[PDB]
């Protein structure tokens, strides 16, 4: 355990402070008297005294017999309860010889015990057998521990509910603190990443929580106002980034400043270590809570369809004065509160997130060092791949090909995503698309069996097979885009005409290969097999040299639990029904999913429930 | 292993590129002909063809029988040797029914095999015998792997010996590279931490190594000049710091840009991962190679004594136009070269290190964000503490007390030291000293037994005991400072007069307690027992509330192997001999150490051999 040396003198008594539970090694400054053969030790009640050979572990009570003198023996003193008054306990070491009855000499040590401890919620409910916890460490995993700090605003009232509580216990005689001081401190590095408010009055006044640790404040002398304990409120100010691993440490040090002719000296130090909760993305397989549609007027059809879908799913709907391309809705999590946090990047000014999104919403942003769209960013369901477990899924980044002059995801955003460390990113090939969003060829829907989900991929090959099957069944003259309402630039085309267009078929073969590259990347990096993948029939055309959807992109869907909002494809009408819609239904309805095809020919984002898996139980 | 999908067509042949050893999954775009019941696969010699159920692992040869058609079966194609000409191999898949003898249809795939690999020295002499080695990872420990990059200059010819070699093998038909391109690339983050030169000519010209990857250069199209392989030389530009963990990655990507009217697409990617070698401090227990004396004139005694000590130790001596307070001599290590590196902090201009220190010397510096002296920094021998092993020792940092207005070690230096990560630092209490250097109370000397060393601590208590013993033996009137040459303000003082000075004895008792704090810190953090510690008798006096040596500081010694240069203490002369020198000899000579007491009533730094333990085998 912890040990501290206190020296005593044969010539005069000594006074010292011992922290409750800390072992005090007591020894004299000079030499024992000549002729010393034996020694005895005594303590007042409440003072535990042990002896131990300095080369052996373990100890035994020392106050019950006369010992043979041996310089290699150590005298250990422990007090477990704080003193009521200064120097209310003492220890005496008496050195003896067999020739005279009185001690040759003796040393007296007066003792004042204080109980000093700096503690936070270590989140050790059932994780690491409390009291065998190194308070200087933060340990990941299902057998770890450590305090958690939430950051609800990072641009680089009664907000106390989001802060983390830090308690300083200072039991002891008040007069001691006339010559001893408690210093709460943190490094300047950590200081510019978090701040601390000390409550100096009732819990109802807003100006009683005084800012004691902050940017330039790296140390603070604690006044003992509220008797035996002082409460502090820690507020995180920065998410983990390329230069910040997320750990924040606070220390308290008891300093002996009684010697006016000497300098101050430390007697005891305690430490609390927080980890900033990372920003976590939510895949489309998590249950929805609120759907956000942002920028459309004169588009009551879209709003009404999204509202009907949300009512069928059971989640609320909110309209705000785009939200899916310049914003991503994640969350931060602590044992005491879960906060949704929006990551913003407007391809500006201070965004009012507490009113547009909600009162319990956080905000994080990153300015470039010199993102195109958050459609370049998705995240997978929980997966296992290459022996490594990813209980919060993996972020999916659609970047640009090596050697290209343009960049889709700036370096600062990639650094932020990797610094969250809980959703290790996977790079995808999207340069073949005209826009280049991951959702244009990829989607995740919940499923009752297998891995609990299916990965949907746009597939020109599946559409080839569907059209060949329909042609063999005598429906080759069925017309695509027949269900559209007679527009001047919407010309119908038959299954035969599509299958006979060599340029279109060859281009869709190329697009299928482009998607196959990502298919194998995802199978390797998400540990997926073919039975986890559903190929959605989807054709593409060339917005010259880049791909765009031939008919509305079926996989670019809105997933609200088991209810799907799917763009209406306007495919070939066979027996008065769209065979593309029928194929999608035959593929997805067996999974218990409900398909709603919405007429699509401006942005939608969903706030979802967090993962059931707690991020601090992960081992990255 | 790695798998890539290549689609074929029943209507026309397909041409594709396969990387040697990579599994190619072959499947058609559309549907098989109606009536398909069976299939066969054939390949030209050198093309391995297997089948595998897509839900099962493992494979078996597919070209020896007629199979029943089953859509869940996968056809796997492997080529292990590069092609000599384009499309020199092919595979045919024929679909059959039992009714007609000819295939209902067939698909032809022409194949060109290329062998592409980006490789570095993975330092896999043993520990792994690479067959499960992820080239995208750098693994610590005695069973790890990964490239190592050396940095010989960090301010934030034939330099090929310090660079790391990276080889790109590109075997294949030349005509393929008329439509396919090799792109060597790295992230901008890594780009501004390292550079890469491509050799584009003979190995004797200095302008043939063209700068191909650098600060703004994140991608480079590789020309195949030297036939089957190209050589690149990687030079690290930044040590690990608070914002750089030390990993540098390079990738090569083969891009298909043959398909006109389409966009380029990736076919293969390979990766090399380097770790920058950290800066490592050398404790005084490591063997010396060269002693550096810097700044003194008119003191031939100091230079002559250091030269005699170095001659007895066997190490060179060098004088240069301070070196221990503003510079620290560590080293960086790779399997191919070990470089001593100076960390500089001039309490200026570009310091010429290759001439003042030596040709094989590196340089590191850190500007403050707004250290007092490198005497605030020491390092321990290898230790084991709290179950954790520290095979390169632990750095010792003498900082200021919490709440003090001054700082001894700036935050940038602490961040650098912690970011090296291989010598986890320990904080020590030095504010009680007038100067505040760790060496004023601490030293490490080699020892033949125990842990292989002894930690020496200045100890007023040991001097108390020595003087009490000498007084009891009748030598109380022996005079300190009798060996002085009768200079002004240098008054002799007897053992009795020292022991009878209550203020001096009390102040040295306080100093002993200040040292005891560090004694317990070091015992805990270095896993030391009392048998590892030697208390050197040392008295202190007060420079106005701060400690300075009463007589010359014995523990502030120069350790050259088993030869010790110890400041001459000028202690009490008993029987014509200094009893302090005699006590130090009785303490240290049994360890096989040779004590030379040097008149010290100028800076000295030592360049030492590196640790025998290789840093990459550590698990931090």
Swiss-Prot record, chains A, B:
What is catalyzed by this enzyme? L-arginyl-[protein] + H2O = L-citrullyl-[protein] + NH4(+)
Q: Which GO terms describe its molecular function?
A: calcium ion binding; identical protein binding; protein-arginine deiminase activity
Instruction: State the disulfide connectivity.
Output: none
Localization terms from the record: Cytoplasm
Q: Which UniProt keywords apply?
A: Calcium, Cytoplasm, Disease variant, Hydrolase
Q: In which tissues is it expressed?
A: Hair follicles, and epidermis at very low levels.
Q: Which CDD domains does the record associate with it?
A: PAD_N (cd04214)
Which spans are transmembrane here? none
Q: Which InterPro entries match?
A: Cupredoxin, PAD, PAD_C, PAD_central_sf, PAD_N, PAD_N_sf, Prot_Arg_deaminase_cen_dom
* Entry annotated with the keyword Calcium: yes
The family database entries (Pfam families) matched by this protein are listed as: PAD, PAD_M, PAD_N
Under Enzyme Commission nomenclature, its number is 3.5.3.15
Question: Which cofactors does this gene product need?
Answer: Ca(2+)
Gene3D superfamilies xrefs = L-arginine/glycine Amidinotransferase, Chain A, Protein-arginine deiminase, central domain, Protein-arginine deiminase, N-terminal domain
| Any one of the GO CC terms | nucleoplasm
Concerning its family, UniProt says: Belongs to the protein arginine deiminase family.
Q: Which disease is it linked to?
A: Uncombable hair syndrome 1: A form of uncombable hair syndrome, a condition characterized by scalp hair that is impossible to comb due to the haphazard arrangement of the hair bundles. A characteristic morphologic feature is a triangular to reniform to heart shape on cross-sections, and a groove, canal or flattening along the entire length of the hair. Most individuals are affected early in childhood and the hair takes on a spun-glass appearance with the hair becoming dry, curly, glossy, lighter in color, and progressively uncombable.
Function field: Catalyzes the deimination of arginine residues of proteins.
Q: What is this protein called?
A: Protein-arginine deiminase type-3
User: Organism source for this protein?
Assistant: Homo sapiens (Human)
């Amino acid at each position: 355990s912890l040990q501290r040396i206190v020296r005593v003198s044969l010539e005069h008594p000594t006074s010292a402070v011992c922290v409750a539970g800390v072992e005090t090694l007591v020894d004299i400054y000079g030499s024992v008297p000549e002729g010393t053969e034996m020694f005895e030790v005594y303590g007042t009640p409440g003072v535990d005294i042990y002896i131990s050979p300095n080369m052996e572990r373990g100890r035994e009570r020392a106050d019950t017999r006369r010992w043979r003198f041996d310089a290699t023996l150590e005298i250990i003193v422990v007090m477990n309860s704080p003193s009521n008054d200064l120097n209310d306990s003492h220890v005496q070491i008496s050195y003896h010889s067999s020739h005279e009855p009185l001690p040759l000499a003796y040393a007296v040590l007066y003792l004042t015990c204080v109980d000093i401890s700096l503690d936070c919620d270590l989140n050790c409910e059932g994780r690491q057998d409390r009291n065998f916890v190194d308070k200087r460490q933060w340990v990941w995993g299902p057998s770890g521990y450590g305090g958690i700090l939430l950051v609800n605003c990072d641009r680089d009232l009664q907000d106390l509910e989001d802060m983390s509580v830090m308690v300083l216990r200072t039991q002891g005689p008040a007069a001691l603190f006339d010559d001893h001081k408690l210093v709460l401190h943190t490094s300047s590095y950590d200081a510019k990443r978090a701040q601390v408010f000390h409550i100096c009055g009732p819990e109802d006044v807003c100006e009683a929580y005084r800012h004691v640790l902050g940017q330039d404040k790296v140390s603070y002398e604690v006044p003992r106002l509220h008797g035996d304990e002082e409460r502090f409120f820690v507020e995180g100010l920065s998410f983990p980034d390329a230069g910040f691993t997320g750990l924040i440490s606070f220390h308290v040090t008891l300093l002996d400043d009684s010697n006016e002719d000497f300098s101050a000296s430390p007697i005891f130090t305690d430490t609390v270590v927080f980890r900033v909760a990372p920003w976590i993305m939510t895949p489309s397989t998590l249950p929805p809570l609120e759907v956000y549609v942002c920028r459309v007027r004169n588009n009551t059809c879209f709003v009404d369809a999204v509202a009907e879908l949300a009512r069928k799913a059971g989640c609320k709907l909110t309209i705000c004065p785009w939200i899916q391309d310049e914003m991503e809705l994640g969350y931060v999590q602590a044992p005491h509160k879960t906060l949704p946090v929006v990551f913003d990047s407007p391809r500006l000014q201070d965004f009012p997130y507490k009113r547009i999104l909600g009162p319990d919403f956080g905000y994080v942003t990153r300015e470039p060092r010199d993102l195109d769209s958050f459609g370049n960013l998705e995240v997978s369901p929980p997966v296992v791949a290459n022996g490594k477990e990813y209980p919060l899924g993996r972020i999916l980044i659609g970047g640009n090909l090596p050697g290209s002059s343009g960049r889709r995801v700036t370096q600062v955003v990639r650094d932020f995503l990797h610094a969250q460390k809980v959703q290790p990113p996977v790079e995808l090939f999207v340069d073949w698309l005209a826009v280049g969003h991951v959702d244009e060829f990829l989607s995740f829907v919940p499923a009752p069996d297998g891995k609990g989900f299916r990965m949907l991929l746009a597939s020109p090959g599946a559409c080839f097979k569907l059209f060949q099957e329909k042609q063999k069944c005598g429906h080759g003259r069925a017309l695509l885009f027949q269900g559209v309402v007679d527009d001047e630039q919407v010309k119908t085309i038959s299954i035969n005409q599509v299958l006979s267009n060599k340029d279109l078929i060859n281009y869709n073969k190329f697009v299928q290969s482009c998607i196959d590259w990502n298919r194998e990347v995802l199978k390797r990096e998400l540990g997926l097999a073919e039975c986890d993948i559903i190929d959605i029939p989807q054709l593409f055309k060339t917005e010259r040299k880049k791909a765009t959807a031939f008919f509305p992109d079926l996989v670019n869907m809105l997933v609200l639990g088991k209810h799907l909002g799917i763009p209406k494809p306007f495919g070939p009408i066979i027996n008065g029904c769209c065979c593309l819609e029928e194929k999608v239904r035959s593929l997805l309805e067996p999974l218990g999913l409900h398909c709603t095809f919405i007429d699509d020919f401006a942005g939608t984002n969903v706030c979802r429930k967090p993962f059931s898996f707690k991020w601090w139980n992960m081992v990255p």
